[PDB]
Amino acid sequence: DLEELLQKIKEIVLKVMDIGDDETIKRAQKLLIKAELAVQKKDLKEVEKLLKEAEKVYKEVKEA
Ligand SMILES: N[C@]12C[C@H]3C[C@H](C[C@H](C3)C1)C2
Numbered sequence: 001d002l003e004e005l006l007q008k009i010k011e012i013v014l015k016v017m018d019i020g021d022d023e024t025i026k027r028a029q030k031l032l033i034k035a036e037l038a039v040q041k042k043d044l045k046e047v048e049k050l051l052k053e054a055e056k057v058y059k060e061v062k063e064a
């Protein structure tokens with residue numbers, strides 16, 4: 001499930017790169033790198049948190 005959550009994070013980062021401004025893109029790219037590190041550490045709770053964070057960042061762009 002670590003890897004699958006990382007996939008969902010990557011999918012959202014792609015959507016942010018498609019519609020977000022460059023500051024939001026940098027925020028999402030840092031989130032992705034953090035998520036890769038958390039996967040490597042097998043820190044499932046952190047990967048779950050970063051997915052919620054990505055969902056929120058994206059929702060806010062999409063709804064602005
Ligand atoms: N302006 C930027 C373009 C691209 C995405 C992001 C980080 C780097 C590379 C600089 C913003």
Ligand SMILES: N[C@]12C[C@H]3C[C@H](C[C@H](C3)C1)C2
Pocket residue numbers: 029032033
């Ligand atoms: N692995 C990366 C994919 C993409 C380009 C670069 C910076 C970010 C976004 C993480 C390497």
